[PDB]
A paper describes a structure:
The [name] ([name]) is a domain of a multi-functional, [name] of coronaviruses.
We determined crystal structures of PLproCoV-2 with an active site [name] mutation, which inactivates [name], in complex with hISG15 at 2.98 Å resolution and with [name]-Ub2 at 1.88 Å resolution. For the PLproCoV-2:hISG15 complex, we observe well-resolved electron density for the proximal and distal UBL domains bound to S1 and S2 sites, respectively. The structures of [name] in both complexes are similar with an rmsd of 0.85 Å, but the binding surface contacts of the proximal Ub are shifted towards the fingers domain of [name] compared to the proximal UBL domain of [name]. This shift in the binding mode is manifested by a 21.7° rotation around the C-termini of hISG15 and Ub, displacing the N-terminal residue by 10.3 Å. By contrast, in our PLproCoV-2:hISG15 structure residue 30 of hISG15 is an alanine, thus leaving M23 alone to stabilize the interaction with F69 of PLproCoV-2, while the N-terminus of hISG15 interacts with V66 of PLproCoV-2. The interaction is centered on a salt bridge between E167 of PLproCoV-2 and R153 of hISG15, while the equivalent arginine (R151) in mISG15 is not oriented properly to form a salt bridge. To compensate for this loss of interaction, N151 of hISG15 makes a hydrogen bond with R166. A closer look at the F69 interacting residues reveals that hISG15 uses M23 to pack against the phenylalanine, while the shorter side chain of I44 in Ub2 is more distant. The strongly attenuated signals of hISG15 residues, including the C-terminal G157, are consistent with our crystal structure of the PLproCoV-2:hISG15 complex. We identified two contacts between D61 and D62 on PLproCoV-2 to K35 on the distal UBL of hISG15 (19 and 43 contacts) which map well onto our structure with the distances between carboxylates (D61 and D62) and Nζ (K35) of 14.9 and 8.6 Å, respectively with Cβ-Cβ ﻿distances below 30 Å consistent with the cross-linker geometry.
Numbering used by the authors:
A (entry chain B): 1 to 157
B (entry chain A): 3 to 314
The structure:
Amino acid sequence: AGWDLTVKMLAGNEFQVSLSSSMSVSELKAQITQKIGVHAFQQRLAVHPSGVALQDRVPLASQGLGPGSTVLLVVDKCDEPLSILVRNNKGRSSTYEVRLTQTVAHLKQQVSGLEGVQDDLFWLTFEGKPLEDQLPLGEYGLKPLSTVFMNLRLRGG
Amino acid sequence: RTIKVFTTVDNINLHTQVVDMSMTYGQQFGPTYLDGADVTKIKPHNSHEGKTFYVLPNDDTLRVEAFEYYHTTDPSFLGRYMSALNHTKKWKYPQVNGLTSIKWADNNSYLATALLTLQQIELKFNPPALQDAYYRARAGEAANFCALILAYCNKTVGELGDVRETMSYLFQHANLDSCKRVLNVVCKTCGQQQTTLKGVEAVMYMGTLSYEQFKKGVQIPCTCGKQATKYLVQQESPFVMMSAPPAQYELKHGTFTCASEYTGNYQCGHYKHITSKETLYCIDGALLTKSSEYKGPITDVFYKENSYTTTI
Ligand SMILES: [Zn+2]
């Protein structure tokens, strides 16, 4: 079984998104991204009209939401610059100014320059999650002074 | 004149299709694959009657079926999966008492090491596609699991690889919610700080190969200039992964589950798998060697765990 959800915006205007039972908040945000082109991390979602917040990894079908239910989306475009730490294999955290809208790829460029290593010989993690080049920094929920780890890539054949 | 085939995305929900033999598969289903072979621009042969073909999700039914199986909406996935499989079905999968490696081909030593490791740690995947393939990999039919591992990790057949990177990518698709780690960091200026970790971070550490060292303390550089001591206070998980830059390390039989050996540099290199069975096995792809003792450049070591509390 698939099912359809109604997204109410604070502009007033509604639209519909197609889900499956096993889908949670990540995929809803990714489906909204599809239809109105807003980064997942810039979307605040809550049940309408109850106005209770969504559980981040448990499925939407598991919570209140079923077919014919409605969800409120409000969009925080705020893109203020912030300081993040990027620690190397030695342990030396260096400070980089970034915006949650700029891509992981763009951050590697900066770290590659400062630590003097080709961009494709290391990968970044935040809280054990690998950072994917093409995605924006905001996806990984970086706060001011959050610490990104630099991992040297072994090249086994 | 026509034949009858099955289109699918999961190999669970089969859809009966009648194909006009004058047109390509591509002209009727879009991108189409027979066991990883791209048959998009191929006209139907007679020998195709009753066989199953994978297709790009191109309607709201196939899309629901596909996400329910793979836990991804990524439109490129079946492309990269089927492209990988087309190579992985042509590899050889030698066993030692049901433990399945891969004969070296297309720089696959890291995959082989990962594959061997995955068969010896208690891990529960969330995408049914990975769980299904993971149960058939333990049974010996492991070509499919390898293609899924390549796709999910977004690596290709031929590309060089890192075992720790690969496990880091897979562990995101595993249920590690019951896993919990409690550490104490003991500075002389910050004081003592106790942090509780959950999921992936509760089972991976980079800094030491020794689990016994991590339990009684390791020196790390702190924010406050000089050297703090990090040690393990409580651990609740079915396994732990301990990684460190490749170093000459002695593996004592019965004191660990399995380990990754890396011989090379940060340009080119080669992985071997070391596992503790009745003696120490060294599995270099298809080649097996037994020894009562082992020394070599170890980078990753997996241990068996249930629930540990410290005595400090
Ligand atoms: Zn300190």
